[PDB]
Design a protein around this ligand. Structure first.
Ligand SMILES: [Zn+2]
Ligand SMILES: [Zn+2]
Ligand SMILES: [Zn+2]
Ligand SMILES: [Zn+2]
Ligand SMILES: [Zn+2]
Ligand SMILES: [Zn+2]
Lengths: 576, 576
């Protein structure tokens, strides 16, 4: 939980270096006014005795009665300029870093591997690009402003005190070592407590996420009591840990102030006891300047905890940015491909496991040919179909599309040549038309969109919708039925005319007649495409050119409907 | 965007009223020290002339040389006590309100209607109970601390100035009207800009949510460019709007400080010009106290924007808490029910629509009877089955369970008597056993859990898992296959032995043989339960006692397999 993680933020402050320099200049101006405001008291005291005296004798008329009031205004304006220049330009830099960090994180998500999204929950990932960035940057920005403003102020004040009387200033200098030791001890405590508070807050988020995501299960199978108890315990821990940090700071700041004022007391005793020929105004200015030291130290003490509290978020932000991305070392970029797909001795095991999902799988697909896949509820049908789009990296075997290994193709170009209907249908919260035409096919004419819907036997329900093809499907298509959502997904794939079309159980939520209207229209456009089908209903794959039956990651049988039935094996048992 | 929303927070500060009073007492102590620190300068100046003078003549020996230094220490300790009492106890109250608000929001989610979760996205809801609460409460807490501390400090200082010389203090009093006008104008700007920044931030979250949730669609159908462009535009708007608010504050604070110092300049001119018989120390103390006014006003000016920035979140937090909950005015709470379910002239239309999903539906179910439902990809099969658990409220018709309308049953008791397998399988990120036994059936012996798994034809794959029944399924069961996940859900329902069992397409992701092993075990425990089945495979419902075919929300045919086939209607066409 070191604060060194903040050093990484500097890489994003390079383009804003010039603006940051201006902020320092403004803070310098503001800091310089603080000693000036103390010095004017010297002349004011002298003026009280003799207001007719002239402030400058070598102007050369302006008496203290008018000069001292005038200087007050000028110093105030000078301080105001520094305040605006420092606060405005520093915020420019801060907001720029927020924008850069957010954009970088979002782009990283678009390139991270599927496993990352698989392991982490959506609530985890969204919090990083909406709240963590703001909190981390805000804490750092406040710290920078205080350290620059209060550090300069202290430096200027000490320099002024040293100029007036270096001997007495030594007393104030001796407190600096004491303050440093106290700051060190407090920081050690803050970091430890910050670790604890961090883990507790994460548990709170986890209980909430598990509930806002599986509300239906909680309602139906009970568990409101179980879930409420978990959240209560989690929240209690976070509050207790957070209070523990407050108590430490509530004693930390007062102690340091006491040290300063104890030292100030000593200094005043010396001035009152061992008084020289110094004028009363000289002494008043010195004491006044010393009294302007406690304020900056208090502000620094307060930020000492804020920095230690934002480190946790920075660690997570700078972890996703360092996460490894999908391997895309290929260069080949063909405009179009014939559609021939060949797999040769392909064996895969999910990363972080020891089970061989698939082993020694070989099959050749040619344009205009239909390939069907059947299995036993987990034979690896969905795993093999997710290796062609290179969603998961394969190490053994060779997957070749149009004669070139899928690895040699640039990820974007390869995925452009393949259209896939995943088993889990997912629909954005937008119009039916916008969902049917997303990304590459975006902007397609309405006529083409409607044509694809007709093929998916979707136009009928889409037309009866309240606003036609412009109706909003709702969040994840909740406003639509399960089979209706599946048909919309089929339409999206049909619109993206690609040489290879993969469909993984695209008729699971459709009846026997609606599924027929889809297979009766897919066979008329199968001549210019290579079709891969993974289905459990042994009725839409009878006309497939080649049918592959898998059993525990191995292809046990090959052939067609007639040959497979004649063999009287796994296919014969499954068909019955 | 009024700040009046914060007034609602007061309802949660009632239990912490006592601690809040102590915080005020501490802040009073701290504020009282500020004028004291200025007054000591009067005696210090007098001491410079005559340190042998006694501070108290009526003690009665302690000279200024020792008394003045001693008082400095005592004031510092007094200030320290007030600081701890104010800062610690105020934080106690603040953290308590955070805990209360979070707990209330979580419990509200457990009672909100399904439509709410349906419309709002998970990212929206999770942000309210993790970040918005912290931000809103933190902003209010900082504001309260500053207004209490700086308001008191200003009051004490003005009282001291009035005591020393009321006539001159009038000059400082005249600036108060000017400051008030400036604060009013600035707040009007802040609120308007805060509205704009709020909407922009929401758009940023929305683009992120649509991406962290549909990453697979973005990868497969392109759209990385489309999505990145959207996020960039959204982030640009937020940054620009946020900067607009910074510039206003960067001019707001310096102007107010200039007003104060201009007034201070006038006061000093008067003292220097029209000097009476007042001692130099008296005048020095007065000027010193006046110079302690600019600091508090600056801090108040800074918080003037922070409050206006947290209002947006408070509006959302206090909106969910006001959202209407599910109607649960029933009182009946039976321990067990026979399982007879009767629907009489039930007609439903989803709230906010004009389409009649279902109309004039009547059917009677008895214990030990099997009821099957068939339809045409959206006839309303899933809508009718979600009215028995009272997920959606019905207005026309009567749904009676065991002779009592489902409305008269307490929601918890009614849902305890019904076991449902939804079409969308959802699994928590925990062990297989913990998912199979969740909520009411939690703590069941391992033997019972395994028995249920055997019935769902799940033990076979569960045993072959790395850690057996203790393996973690992963987030939403990603580590498990689709059919495997469905079988786990079936097991959960089987464990929760209930009089009524509803299954909506529980074999969509299963093959013809695995589905047979489930129907061969479900028929042996169907005598003591009432089963409702909504399936598209016309092979597991042939043995159903009554089969109901729906067509656009109306039951068109009734009977059994033989009678329905003889009729040669919708069932005959669908079966083929
Ligand atoms: Zn995560
Ligand atoms: Zn989690
Ligand atoms: Zn699958
Ligand atoms: Zn929402
Ligand atoms: Zn949204
Ligand atoms: Zn349905």
């Amino acid at each position: 939980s070191s604060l060194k993680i903040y050093f990484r933020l500097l890489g994003y402050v390079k383009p804003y270096i010039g603006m940051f320099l201006l902020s320092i200049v403004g803070f310098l101006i503001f800091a310089s006014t603080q000693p000036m405001l103390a010095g004017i008291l010297k002349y004011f005291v002298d003026g009280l005795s003799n207001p007719d005296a002239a402030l400058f004798p070598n102007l050369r008329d302006l008496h203290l009665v008018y000069a001292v009031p005038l200087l007050i205004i000028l110093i105030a304006a000078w301080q105001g300029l520094g305040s605006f220049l420092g606060n405005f330009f520093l915020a420019k830099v801060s907001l720029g870093l927020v924008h850069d960090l957010r954009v970088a994180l979002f782009n990283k998500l678009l390139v991270l591997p599927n496993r990352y999204f698989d392991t982490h929950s959506s609530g985890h990932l969204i919090s990083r690009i909406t709240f963590n960035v703001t909190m981390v940057t805000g804490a750092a920005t406040d710290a920078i402003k205080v350290v620059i403003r209060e550090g300069l102020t202290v430096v200027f004040l000490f320099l002024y005190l040293l100029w007036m009387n270096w001997k007495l200033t030594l007393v104030m200098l001796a407190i600096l070592p004491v303050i440093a030791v106290m700051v060190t001890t407090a920081s050690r405590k803050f970091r430890k407590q910050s670790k604890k508070i961090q883990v507790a807050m994460g548990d709170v988020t986890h209980v909430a996420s598990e509930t806002i995501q599986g509300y239906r299960v909680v309602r139906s199978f009970g568990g409101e009591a179980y879930e409420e108890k978990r959240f209560l315990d989690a929240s209690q821990s976070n509050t207790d840990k957070q209070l523990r940090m407050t108590k430490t700071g509530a004693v930390y700041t007062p102690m340091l102030q006491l040290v300063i004022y104890v030292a100030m007391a000593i200094l005043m005793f010396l001035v009152l006891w061992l008084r020289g020929d110094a004028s009363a105004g000289d002494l008043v200015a010195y004491i006044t300047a010393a009294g302007l030291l406690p304020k900056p130290i208090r502000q620094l003490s307060e930020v000492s905890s804020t920095v230690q509290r934002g480190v946790a978020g920075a660690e997570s932000i700078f972890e996703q940015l360092d996460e490894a991305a999908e391997e895309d070392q290929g260069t080949v970029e063909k405009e179009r491909v014939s559609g021939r797909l060949e797999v040769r001795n392909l064996s895969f095991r999910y990363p972080g496991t020891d089970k061989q999902v698939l082993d020694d799988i070989s099959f050749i697909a040619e344009p205009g040919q239909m390939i069907a896949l059947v299995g036993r509820s987990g034979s690896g049908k969905s795993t093999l179909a997710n290796l062609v789009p290179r969603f998961y990296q394969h190490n053994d075997g060779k997957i070749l599309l149009d004669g070139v290994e899928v690895e040699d193709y640039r990820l974007r170009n390869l995925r452009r040549h393949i259209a896939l209907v995943t088993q889990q249908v997912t629909l954005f919260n937008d119009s039916v038309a916008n969902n049917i035409a997303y990304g590459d096919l975006a902007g397609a004419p309405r006529e083409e969109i409607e044509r694809a819907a007709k093929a998916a036997n979707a136009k009928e329900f889409i037309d009866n919708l309240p606003q036609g093809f412009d109706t909003e499907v709702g969040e994840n298509g909740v406003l639509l039925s399960g089979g209706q959502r599946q048909r919309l997904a089929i339409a999206r794939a049909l619109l993206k005319d690609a040489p290879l079309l993969i469909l993984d159980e695209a008729t699971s939520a459709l009846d026997t007649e609606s599924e027929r209207h889809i297979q009766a229209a897919l066979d008329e456009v199968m001549k210019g495409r290579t079709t891969l089908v993974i289905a459990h209903r042994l009725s839409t794959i009878e006309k497939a050119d080649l049918i592959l039956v898998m059993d525990q990651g191995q292809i046990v049988e090959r052939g067609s409907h007639a040959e497979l039935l004649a063999q009287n094996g796994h296919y014969a048992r499954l068909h019955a």
